[PDB]
Design a protein around this ligand. Structure first.
Ligand SMILES: [Cl-]
Length: 178
């Protein structure tokens, strides 16, 4: 940190063209003859895009200050989502962009444990738990259903308002009755 091609490993957090990246794939190439080099697959952490780059040995990459933390959700005010560390009791706030898709899965007062990716101490991405239990607020007698967070999902015809369902947040899909 600085890192050289020798350091490259899967999941390594590096800066590339002024963007924090995570190394997905690293492959060693020993040419005959000549300097060995690395072909690396990188995920851009701000964009989610995947990059393919070749690094000659002797190439250098600055480390990116990327850390992932588990934190409990407290509340949001429509613009900032607030989390507390259950051991440290330090608080951090994430904005709408950092929350992304996770905001629609977090119930008021749920206290869900979330995974927060921090870039230079600032939340960059947030992930909700894989599965959450949310109440159906709007649905008529599958069929569309509006959950209490405003998220919309398809539920079986038998589900009724004020009933609760378990949802897979990765796919945004109903899983089962709650
Ligand atoms: Cl369904």
């Amino acid at each position: 940190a600085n890192y050289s091609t020798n350091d490259f490993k899967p999941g390594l957090k590096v800066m590339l063209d002024s963007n924090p990246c995570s190394i997905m794939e690293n492959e060693y190439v020993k040419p005959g003859k000549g300097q060995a080099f690395n072909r690396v697959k990188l995920r851009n952490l701000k964009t989610g895009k995947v990059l393919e780059k070749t690094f000659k040995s002797g190439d250098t990459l600055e480390a990116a200050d990327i850390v992932e933390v588990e934190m409990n959700y407290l509340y949001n005010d429509g613009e900032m989502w607030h989390f507390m560390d259950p051991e440290s009791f330090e608080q951090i706030a994430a904005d709408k962009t950092a929350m992304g898709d996770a905001a629609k899965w977090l119930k008021d007062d749920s206290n869900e444990t979330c995974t927060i990716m921090l870039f230079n101490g600032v939340p960059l991405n947030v992930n909700a738990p894989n599965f959450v239990v949310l109440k159906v607020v709007e649905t008529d007698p599958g069929k569309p259903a509006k959950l209490e967070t405003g998220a919309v999902v398809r539920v079986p015809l038998f589900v009724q308002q004020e009933e609760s369902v378990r949802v897979d947040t990765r796919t945004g899909e109903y899983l089962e009755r709650a």
